[PDB]
Amino acid sequence: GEFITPGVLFLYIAGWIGWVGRSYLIAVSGEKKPAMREIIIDVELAARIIPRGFIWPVAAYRELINGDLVVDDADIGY
Amino acid sequence: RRVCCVVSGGVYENVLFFPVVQMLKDRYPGVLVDVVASARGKQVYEMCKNVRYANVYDPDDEWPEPAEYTHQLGVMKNRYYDMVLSTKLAGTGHALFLFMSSAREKVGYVYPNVNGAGAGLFLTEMFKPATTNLADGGYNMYQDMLEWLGRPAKGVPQQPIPPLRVSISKKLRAVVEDKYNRAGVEKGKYVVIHGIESDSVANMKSRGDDDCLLPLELWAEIAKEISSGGNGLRPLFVMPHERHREEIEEIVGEETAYLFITTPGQLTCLINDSAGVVATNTAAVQLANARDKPCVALFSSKEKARLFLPYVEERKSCTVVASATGKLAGIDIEAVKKAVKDL
Amino acid sequence: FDKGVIDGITNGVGLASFCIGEEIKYVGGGRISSYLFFFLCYVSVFLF
Amino acid sequence: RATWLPGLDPPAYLDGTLPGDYGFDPLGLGEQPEDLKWYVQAELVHCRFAMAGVAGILGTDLIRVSGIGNLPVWFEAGATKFDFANTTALFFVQLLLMGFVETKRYMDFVSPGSQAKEGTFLGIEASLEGLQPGYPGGPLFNPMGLAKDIENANEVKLKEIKNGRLAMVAMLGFIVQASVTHAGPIDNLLTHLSDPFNKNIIHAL
Amino acid sequence: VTSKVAASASATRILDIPFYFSSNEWHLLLEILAILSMILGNLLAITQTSMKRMLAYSSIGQIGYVIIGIIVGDSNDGYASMITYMLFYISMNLGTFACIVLFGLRTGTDNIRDYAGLYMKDPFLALSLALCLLSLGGLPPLAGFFGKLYLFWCGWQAGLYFLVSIGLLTSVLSIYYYLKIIKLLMTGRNQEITPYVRNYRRSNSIELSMTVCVIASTIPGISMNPILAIAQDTLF
Amino acid sequence: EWFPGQPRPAHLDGSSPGDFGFDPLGLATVPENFERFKESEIYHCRWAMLCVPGVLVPEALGLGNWVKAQEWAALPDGQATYLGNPVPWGNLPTILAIEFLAIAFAEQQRTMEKDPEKKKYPGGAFDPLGFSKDPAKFEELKLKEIKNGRLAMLAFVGFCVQQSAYPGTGPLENLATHLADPWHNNIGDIV
Numbered sequence A: 001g002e003f004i005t006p007g008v009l010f011l012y013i014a015g016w017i018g019w020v021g022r023s024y025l026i027a028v029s030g031e032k033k034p035a036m037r038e039i040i041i042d043v044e045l046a047a048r049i050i051p052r053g054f055i056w057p058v059a060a061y062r063e064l065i066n067g068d069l070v071v072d073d074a075d076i077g078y
Numbered sequence B: 001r002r003v004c005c006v007v008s009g010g011v012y013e014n015v016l017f018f019p020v021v022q023m024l025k026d027r028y029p030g031v032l033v034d035v036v037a038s039a040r041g042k043q044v045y046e047m048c049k050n051v052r053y054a055n056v057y058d059p060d061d062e063w064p065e066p067a068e069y070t071h072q073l074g075v076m077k078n079r080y081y082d083m084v085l086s087t088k089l090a091g092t093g094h095a096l097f098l099f100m101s102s103a104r105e106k107v108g109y110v111y112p113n114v115n116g117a118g119a120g121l122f123l124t125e126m127f128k129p130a131t132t133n134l135a136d137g138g139y140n141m142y143q144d145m146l147e148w149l150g151r152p153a154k155g156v157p158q159q160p161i162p163p164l165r166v167s168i169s170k171k172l173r174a175v176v177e178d179k180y181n182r183a184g185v186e187k188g189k190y191v192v193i194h195g196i197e198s199d200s201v202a203n204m205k206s207r208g209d210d211d212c213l214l215p216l217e218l219w220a221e222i223a224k225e226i227s228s229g230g231n232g233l234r235p236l237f238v239m240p241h242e243r244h245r246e247e248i249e250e251i252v253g254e255e256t257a258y259l260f261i262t263t264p265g266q267l268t269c270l271i272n273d274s275a276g277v278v279a280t281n282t283a284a285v286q287l288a289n290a291r292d293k294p295c296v297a298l299f300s301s302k303e304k305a306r307l308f309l310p311y312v313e314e315r316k317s318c319t320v321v322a323s324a325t326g327k328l329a330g331i332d333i334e335a336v337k338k339a340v341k342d343l
Numbered sequence C: 001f002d003k004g005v006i007d008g009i010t011n012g013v014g015l016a017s018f019c020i021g022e023e024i025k026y027v028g029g030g031r032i033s034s035y036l037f038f039f040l041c042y043v044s045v046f047l048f
Numbered sequence D: 001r002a003t004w005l006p007g008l009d010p011p012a013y014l015d016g017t018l019p020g021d022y023g024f025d026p027l028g029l030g031e032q033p034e035d036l037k038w039y040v041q042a043e044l045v046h047c048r049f050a051m052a053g054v055a056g057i058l059g060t061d062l063i064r065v066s067g068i069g070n071l072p073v074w075f076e077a078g079a080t081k082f083d084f085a086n087t088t089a090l091f092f093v094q095l096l097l098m099g100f101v102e103t104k105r106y107m108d109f110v111s112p113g114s115q116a117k118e119g120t121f122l123g124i125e126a127s128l129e130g131l132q133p134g135y136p137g138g139p140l141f142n143p144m145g146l147a148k149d150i151e152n153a154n155e156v157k158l159k160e161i162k163n164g165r166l167a168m169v170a171m172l173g174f175i176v177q178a179s180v181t182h183a184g185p186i187d188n189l190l191t192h193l194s195d196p197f198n199k200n201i202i203h204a205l
Numbered sequence E: 001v002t003s004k005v006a007a008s009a010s011a012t013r014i015l016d017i018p019f020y021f022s023s024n025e026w027h028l029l030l031e032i033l034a035i036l037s038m039i040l041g042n043l044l045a046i047t048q049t050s051m052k053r054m055l056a057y058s059s060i061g062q063i064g065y066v067i068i069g070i071i072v073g074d075s076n077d078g079y080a081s082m083i084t085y086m087l088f089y090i091s092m093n094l095g096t097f098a099c100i101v102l103f104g105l106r107t108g109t110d111n112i113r114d115y116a117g118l119y120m121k122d123p124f125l126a127l128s129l130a131l132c133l134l135s136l137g138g139l140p141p142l143a144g145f146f147g148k149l150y151l152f153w154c155g156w157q158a159g160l161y162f163l164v165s166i167g168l169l170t171s172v173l174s175i176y177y178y179l180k181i182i183k184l185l186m187t188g189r190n191q192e193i194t195p196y197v198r199n200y201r202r203s204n205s206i207e208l209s210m211t212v213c214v215i216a217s218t219i220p221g222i223s224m225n226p227i228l229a230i231a232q233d234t235l236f
Numbered sequence F: 001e002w003f004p005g006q007p008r009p010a011h012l013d014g015s016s017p018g019d020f021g022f023d024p025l026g027l028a029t030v031p032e033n034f035e036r037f038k039e040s041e042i043y044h045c046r047w048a049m050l051c052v053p054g055v056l057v058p059e060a061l062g063l064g065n066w067v068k069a070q071e072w073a074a075l076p077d078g079q080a081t082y083l084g085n086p087v088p089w090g091n092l093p094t095i096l097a098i099e100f101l102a103i104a105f106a107e108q109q110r111t112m113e114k115d116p117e118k119k120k121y122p123g124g125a126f127d128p129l130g131f132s133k134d135p136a137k138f139e140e141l142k143l144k145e146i147k148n149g150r151l152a153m154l155a156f157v158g159f160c161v162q163q164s165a166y167p168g169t170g171p172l173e174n175l176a177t178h179l180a181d182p183w184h185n186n187i188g189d190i191v
């Protein structure tokens, strides 16, 4: 409970912030201009995504296996 | 030697079991052969000359309470059968029910792959797939395993015993047939029509979609030219094997003189007292084709090679009309009446 | 919970015998070589 | 369609062929087939372990308190000992056979039917598949072969699902219940039944 | 009858005289046999349909159990009970064998399913077979009951418990096939009896043997007092 | 197959003795790597099968284990004991020199031939009877050798690991230890 237990407590939270933010950027990625939906955040869409970070360890680990957590050689532009 | 058959199902898939019983009583002479079937099926064994006495245990439920289970085993075992040949496609649970009956030769059917393919070690001569579609092919494995398998007994002992040869006791032949006939019009010169509606008529356990019924309009169109002409001039027998007191009030084959009867699977005599019969694929087909009884079978299409093997019964008497559309409730009813008007 | 449970038990105590008897009755079954084999197995194991 | 949330509509992918399809997966955790296909077994294996698991926790403490028999608490069972049982070896032993049975099941889902065509005799027939991935009934795994594989599968699996779903919750109860009460599960029930309005989780804290 | 008598006469002497020391290592051994002998010799006996084979199972495969059931538990206070049980078993076995020989010769079959209706055709033979069969079952007023009883009462009096309980349980189990064949005797369903008992011209030596061997399966069980007083003087 | 349910890595299509679809690290991608591995495999098999009974049977007699039978060389005045008998040449530099020249030369005789099939199956003077007569039997003869040889290597691994876990032990001494109380003497007690 000095380092390891608080440490795991952080790593759970840190992904939750990380995993949610990733979902939103992907979610708004397919729009006319994703620029506008990030300086003016869509609150409702960020509300139906805010809990999906409760299960990020499960969800991500499936992405890694399925191979959608990363891309390969298509980097800039698209 | 004693033998027990455990044939399953209702009527149409049990009336076809007579060839197997005759082959048993022919191969091993002087054999007491009993049978256990379902309540609706046991009704068929009231017209035969081989079985000793029937019984009723297995509609083959899932639960059946474990006192009616034991007592059934407690009556199969305590008569010491020798070869309990079976049906109903035993897997690995129903095989134990045969096995505990301490006989000598347990022969039956089994599931190919489904329902726990299994088939167990404690059996003998397990064979072909399950759903038992074709008729007069039927138990086709059985009419080969009981054929010359063993010994100097002659070459295959009369391969597939003559087709259905059901007999009628003269008591039932006279009294009940007469009473029900003369209730309404009766001359022994009428025509039976069977396929009407759907409660428990025969249902054939295998036809599936067609032959269950006709919309009773085709039946009216047929019947209006059946008695037309001095050929019969009697026949208005819609012969509803239903709760037809729930249907007789709607015989749009106008209720003027369209008679009606309620029957168990006893109607074999009523067929034998008719002047023909016109019906869909049902027990009436096999029953009429058993005797001479020129029949007219109207099932969907090309199922003849499954449900009607003796295409020429006596003189190509029993004729069959198919449906080019495939669905039974569309036929050249005009040509149907053309064919029917001759008999 | 009367027929399905306690009747089930009071029959399965009299039904499991009907199965066990015929089950252990269908091992060996002739073939004197098998008789002598199963007669030697017990002699050998009993030496412990 | 009688979902879990009356007003809410069920999601589009939980069509309903899976038994216990009460349109409930809010977090978007099953919107990919290969995901969803592998998730169903988890609920099937979890629930079955959670059906027996609660009974072992439940029944053992029930018989002990009444006095018919005597056993330690499931909480206290981990350190129990009678003879010839090093908890070292048992772990290895249990890991072995469970490792054996778990994998061959895993190979079944990975490759259906590629589990019953091999050399080893006398058993190479039953462990094929039940014809439904999560139900490997065969004439050894269903020694009372009592299934038709289609009809009741809608109406009986739905019992085993809603049975399990409840049972998985119940076990989660004891873990927390033992975590706070320091006592047995029935003890928790017996205590609360005594003074319900004073024996509550509000008082337990 | 005589193979079992001679073998059980040789066994006690060959195991008690030169094997003083090894008691605790063969007392157990014989027990392992008995606990099996009175089980595997009964289960199969249920499923039988032949008379001779069912008799082999029941009257030998099992009944060679409770004889031994005291050889292990013997401080010379039990051998009398072995002698008495052998004297009972000889008679209660020769009776049913005489009845079986007589009926088989008179008809020409062995399988159980042909003994139906035999009570109506000839009731004396059916009765004198039912008596011996029930005695083998071990019912109170008969002799087999008192045999098994005095075999247990001296054998529970010697400490060992997990052999008397099994004996009583397998006796209860053995009641089954005895009552089965008995039920098959008493019947009147004319259309069931095979044409074997139907042609049975009912009717010296075999009659005499069967009738003087069957009353010795009912009287000594109640008159075992002098037999017991006689069997107590055995030191070997 | 070793793992019923996995597809064969394309380069293992039987076509070899003792080949059951097991190459998870793809070590045998290169056929040249593939063939040389077979050599090392059969050799590591061949030596191991010799060495295991030579580790055990001495322990089955009054002789010391496979560890004690190397110990006199540690002390400077070491002299060996074969069947307990102090062989004169048992001093370490003596056997070492005899070991080096003989092992190298014969093993160099291996390194100087490239059939390459004979580099696995020389036979001939190494088959004084000629079991290779029946090609069917000889092909199965390799199988027995391969599977037994693989069996030996594992037994060798067990012997050595049991020594690190239990210094100064014998495999039969280890075996009997388990044989006392199998349920309290196991690999469970190491970790």
Ligand code: CLA
Binding pocket: A017, A018, A019, A020, A021, A022, A024, A041, A046
């Ligand atoms: C969704 C948010 C998000 C995510 C998932 C990532 C992910 C990543 N960043 Mg990162 N980054 C972000 C936002 C994010 N970034 C922002 C906003 C900034 C500007 C300050 C940066 C600046 C940054 C730098 C400078 C570097 C990374 C790096 C990385 C990588 C390693 C992780 C790390 O070092 O964290 C870095 C974490 C931080 C710098 C902390 C700031 C991130 C903020 C707190 C999160 C913002 C979340 C968002 C506002 C919430 C949206 C919610 C929505 C519902 C509205 C990883 C790919 C490193 C890399 O390349 O490694 C490979 C690296 O060097 N990032």
Ligand SMILES: CC(/C=C/C=C(C)/C=C/[C@@]12O[C@]1(C)C[C@@H](O)CC2(C)C)=C\C=C\C=C(C)\C=C\C=C(C)\C=C\[C@@]12O[C@]1(C)C[C@@H](O)CC2(C)C
Binding pocket: A055, D024, D025, D026, D027, D028, D029, D046, D047, D049, D050, D051, D052, D053, D054, D055, D056, D057, D073, D074, D075, D077, D078, D168, D169, D171, D172
């Ligand atoms: C397997 C299990 C328990 C098994 C218990 C066992 C073996 C017990 C064993 C023992 O007692 C015995 C037998 C004897 C003792 O001596 C030994 C022990 C060991 C003590 C519980 C599972 C318990 C599992 C539970 C409760 C899971 C709950 C999951 C939930 C609620 C998830 C919900 C969602 O995922 C969905 C459904 C959809 C998403 O969109 C929304 C969210 C919310 C994310």
Ligand SMILES: CC1=C(/C=C/C(C)=C/C=C/C(C)=C\C=C\C=C(C)\C=C\C=C(C)\C=C\C2=C(C)CCCC2(C)C)C(C)(C)CCC1
Binding pocket: A014, A015, A016, A018, A019, A022, A056, A060
């Ligand atoms: C145990 C421990 C330790 C150690 C540790 C370590 C050593 C670690 C390592 C680690 C590592 C070596 C790692 C690596 C990694 C890599 C990678 C590659 C990763 C990745 C990741 C990712 C990719 C993620 C992503 C995501 C998610 C999932 C969430 C959030 C969002 C995102 C998208 C970002 C210590 C001593 C400290 C202490 C004690 C404990």
